[PDB]
Design a protein around this nucleic acid. Structure first.
Length: 44
DNA sequence: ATAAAATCACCCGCACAGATTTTTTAAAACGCGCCACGGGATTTTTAAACCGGTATTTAACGGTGTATGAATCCCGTTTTATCTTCCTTTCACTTTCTTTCTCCAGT
């Protein structure tokens, strides 16, 4: 209800995995077909 | 190299609150002087003590029915004891400027 217990390990793992996957797949690595990051493609 | 979140100076007019800065004014002070007042030595008069006596006026005493003084419990007020601090100060160190001493190539 208003208060629900949660273990710290699960929260840490979920949040860090989400952040790491988002950063790896959508911010820093280029594509092999056109060699562009998402920001470059959006600007163009 | 991509993301998340932040910070400061000045220009132009106008109205007002607060902080210096002259300017004026009333109190305190100084010097000189004179006459109002108090001391000293006589006259005069009256306030209060003393004898009466009488005629009131007060205070001590015995019942009822309260209003308040000491005790307890709190909370804002002011004192006092107790921490940190920025400018003064020198001072050994470092840095930076000024003069001097050679080198030294050229003729």
């Amino acid at each position: 209800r208003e208060i629900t217990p949660v273990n710290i390990e699960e929260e840490l793992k979920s949040s860090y995995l989400d952040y790491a996957m988002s950063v790896i797949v959508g911010r820093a690595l280029p594509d092999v077909r056109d060699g562009l990051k998402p920001v470059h493609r959006r600007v163009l």
